[PDB]
Write an enzyme that holds these catalytic residues in place. Structure first.
Site, PDB file in Angstrom:
ATOM      1  N   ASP A  34      35.291  90.324  -7.443  1.00 27.37           N
ATOM      2  CA  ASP A  34      34.726  91.703  -6.797  1.00 27.37           C
ATOM      3  C   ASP A  34      35.611  91.871  -5.433  1.00 27.37           C
ATOM      4  OD1 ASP A  34      33.405  89.676  -5.173  1.00 27.37           O
ATOM      5  OD2 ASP A  34      31.857  91.244  -4.623  1.00 27.37           O
TER       6      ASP A  34
ATOM      7  N   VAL B 263      39.515  77.649   3.108  1.00 30.37           N
ATOM      8  CA  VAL B 263      40.407  78.002   1.904  1.00 30.37           C
ATOM      9  C   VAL B 263      40.913  79.300   2.360  1.00 30.37           C
ATOM     10  CG1 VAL B 263      39.789  76.306  -0.004  1.00 30.37           C
ATOM     11  CG2 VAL B 263      38.633  78.371   0.162  1.00 30.37           C
ATOM     12  N   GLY B 264      40.414  80.009   3.269  1.00 35.10           N
ATOM     13  CA  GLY B 264      40.781  81.337   3.687  1.00 35.10           C
ATOM     14  C   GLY B 264      39.858  82.530   4.321  1.00 35.10           C
ATOM     15  N   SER B 265      40.377  83.696   4.040  1.00 34.18           N
ATOM     16  CA  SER B 265      39.520  84.961   4.455  1.00 34.18           C
ATOM     17  C   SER B 265      40.068  86.297   3.903  1.00 34.18           C
ATOM     18  CB  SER B 265      39.672  85.042   6.028  1.00 34.18           C
ATOM     19  OG  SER B 265      39.066  83.930   6.724  1.00 34.18           O
TER      20      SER B 265
ATOM     21  N   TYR C 133      35.479  90.899   6.009  1.00 35.61           N
ATOM     22  CA  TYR C 133      34.665  90.825   4.775  1.00 35.61           C
ATOM     23  C   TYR C 133      33.780  89.567   4.714  1.00 35.61           C
ATOM     24  N   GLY C 134      34.208  88.318   5.282  1.00 39.04           N
ATOM     25  CA  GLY C 134      33.707  86.987   5.370  1.00 39.04           C
ATOM     26  C   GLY C 134      34.681  85.953   4.970  1.00 39.04           C
ATOM     27  N   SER C 135      34.369  84.602   5.247  1.00 40.06           N
ATOM     28  CA  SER C 135      35.238  83.559   4.913  1.00 40.06           C
ATOM     29  C   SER C 135      34.751  82.567   3.917  1.00 40.06           C
ATOM     30  CB  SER C 135      35.800  82.968   6.293  1.00 40.06           C
ATOM     31  OG  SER C 135      34.806  81.913   6.760  1.00 40.06           O
ATOM     32  N   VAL C 136      35.508  81.908   3.267  1.00 37.31           N
ATOM     33  CA  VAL C 136      35.354  81.133   2.220  1.00 37.31           C
ATOM     34  C   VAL C 136      35.553  79.594   2.646  1.00 37.31           C
ATOM     35  CG1 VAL C 136      36.011  80.718  -0.286  1.00 37.31           C
ATOM     36  CG2 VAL C 136      35.701  83.036   0.592  1.00 37.31           C
TER      37      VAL C 136
HETATM   38  O1  LIG Z   1      37.374  80.580  -6.493  1.00 36.68           O
HETATM   39  C1  LIG Z   1      37.606  81.540  -5.993  1.00 36.68           C
HETATM   40  C2  LIG Z   1      36.118  82.517  -5.797  1.00 36.68           C
HETATM   41  C3  LIG Z   1      36.392  83.729  -4.773  1.00 36.68           C
HETATM   42  C4  LIG Z   1      35.014  84.378  -4.363  1.00 36.68           C
HETATM   43  C5  LIG Z   1      34.198  83.416  -3.695  1.00 36.68           C
HETATM   44  C6  LIG Z   1      32.852  83.926  -3.486  1.00 36.68           C
HETATM   45  C7  LIG Z   1      32.767  85.347  -3.515  1.00 36.68           C
HETATM   46  O2  LIG Z   1      31.599  85.931  -3.208  1.00 36.68           O
HETATM   47  C8  LIG Z   1      33.720  86.189  -4.216  1.00 36.68           C
HETATM   48  C9  LIG Z   1      35.049  85.471  -4.492  1.00 36.68           C
HETATM   49  O3  LIG Z   1      37.196  83.320  -3.714  1.00 36.68           O
HETATM   50  C10 LIG Z   1      38.560  83.057  -4.498  1.00 36.68           C
HETATM   51  C11 LIG Z   1      39.852  83.623  -3.692  1.00 36.68           C
HETATM   52  C12 LIG Z   1      41.144  83.341  -4.372  1.00 36.68           C
HETATM   53  O4  LIG Z   1      42.113  83.772  -3.927  1.00 36.68           O
HETATM   54  C13 LIG Z   1      41.106  82.389  -5.582  1.00 36.68           C
HETATM   55  C14 LIG Z   1      39.944  81.909  -6.158  1.00 36.68           C
HETATM   56  O5  LIG Z   1      39.877  80.936  -7.017  1.00 36.68           O
HETATM   57  C15 LIG Z   1      38.724  82.055  -5.317  1.00 36.68           C
END
Ligand SMILES: O=C1C[C@@H](c2ccc(O)cc2)Oc2cc(O)cc(O)c21
Ligand SMILES: Nc1ccc2c(NC3CC3)nc(-c3ccccc3)nc2c1
Length: 339
Positions: free
Chosen positions: A163, A27-29, A30-33
């Site tokens: 955060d 879904v995107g990118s 400190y680390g990746s998600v």
């Molecule tokens: O749903 C999330 C959680 C967030 C997140 C995940 C893990 C973490 O440790 C801190 C933040 O990433 C995101 C980033 C976005 O642009 C929109 C979002 O809705 C989210």
């Protein structure tokens, strides 16, 4: 004890997560998600894999800080921790950290950038921000980086403070006492960001679109007026004092002319949030009592946080010490209850 992990190459980077988390999807990118399905709760979740969490003293402290902060946040309008895990069996091979939180649809950037919002939507969105800020502030935490991409909003218009968001410049929402590099600012730097956010929701335009830190100041003082003698006498730096009073004495604008046709209660809150003098700026708690939130404000449903120990922030430790403190926090994680 330990559940069954499984591996995969997900684009740029590799992932080893417990079998509980299925259908990982970038879904995107400190680390990746990644987005995932959590078989245990039935939830869609975000799994975040920290990039090299222990590569320097800075990274290691940051990883620890982040983990302590998330474990502590338990509040509707603040992102909290569903799970934290490592594929490591022992401290010896502890090298990767994954964090699991609720997944949210979009950020606040994604709603304002395409449209306006009506007055009732800003009310409820800002109300929820101030409500989460009240809770964060009550633990002596200051956010410092509040901006639209750090506010997650679901399709129900429910809002959570993140955060660190997904990657509009940071400086556009920064309080003037941080532009000027004041060492001693307080919690209300965050109130200043809220004022900028609200303004942007109400009008559809960045309130203070500075190209740099000097332009930024120029644009701020042009709405709020150059500082009077009462503020000027509280500035400790000779040079800041000189810059400020070396500038042309701009007068304070009437907000009702800048925010023409907005709810007069919204204009009043903004007057109280965008005060150049930090000592006079309204707090989160006080702002929750403001007439503008009359339809949402409930003092028995705006809780404060447990005590948060951040004595660690002043410590200078070895990479292996931060690493091991971080491991302890993984090990002792108690999941929050289902419901
Ligand atoms: O749903 C999330 C959680 C967030 C997140 C995940 C893990 C973490 O440790 C801190 C933040 O990433 C995101 C980033 C976005 O642009 C929109 C979002 O809705 C989210
Ligand atoms: N009680 C206060 C209230 C506001 C303050 C402020 N605000 C600047 C107008 C934006 N700036 C500064 C400061 C001091 C030294 C160096 C740089 C900045 N101090 C402040 C003390």
């Amino acid at each position: 004890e330990r559940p069954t992990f499984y591996r995969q190459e997900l684009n740029k980077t590799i992932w080893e997560v417990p079998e509980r988390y299925q259908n990982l999807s970038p879904v995107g990118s400190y680390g990746s998600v990644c987005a995932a399905f959590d078989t245990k709760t039935g939830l869609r979740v975000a799994v975040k894999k920290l990039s090299r969490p222990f590569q320097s003293i800075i990274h290691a402290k940051r990883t620890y800080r982040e983990l302590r902060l998330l474990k502590h946040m338990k509040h509707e309008n603040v992102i909290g921790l569903l799970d934290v895990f490592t594929p490591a069996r022992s401290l010896e091979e502890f090298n990767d950290v994954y964090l699991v939180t609720h997944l949210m649809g979009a950020d606040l950037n994604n709603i304002v950038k395409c449209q306006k919002l009506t007055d009732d939507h800003v009310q409820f969105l800002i109300y929820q921000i101030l409500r989460g800020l009240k809770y964060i502030h009550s633990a002596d935490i200051i956010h410092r980086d509040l901006k639209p991409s750090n506010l997650a909003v679901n399709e129900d218009c429910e809002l959570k403070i993140l955060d660190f968001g997904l990657a509009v410049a940071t400086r556009w929402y920064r309080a003037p006492e941080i532009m000027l590099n004041w060492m001693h600012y307080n919690q209300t730097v965050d109130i200043w960001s809220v004022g900028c956010i609200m303004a942007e929701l109400l009008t559809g335009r960045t309130l203070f679109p500075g190209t740099d830190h000097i332009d930024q100041l120029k644009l701020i003082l042009r709405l709020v007026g150059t500082p009077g003698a009462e503020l000027l006498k509280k500035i400790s730096s000779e040079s800041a004092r000189n810059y400020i009073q070396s500038l042309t004495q701009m007068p304070k604008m009437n907000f009702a002319n800048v925010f023409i046709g907005a709810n007069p209660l919204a204009v009043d809150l903004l007057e109280k949030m965008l005060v150049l003098d930090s000592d006079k700026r309204i707090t989160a708690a006080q702002a929750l009592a403001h007439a503008y939130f009359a339809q949402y404000h409930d003092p028995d449903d705006e809780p404060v946080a447990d005590p948060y120990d951040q004595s660690f922030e002043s410590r200078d430790l070895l990479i292996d010490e931060w690493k091991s403190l971080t491991y302890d926090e993984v090990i002792s994680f108690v999941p929050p209850p289902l419901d």
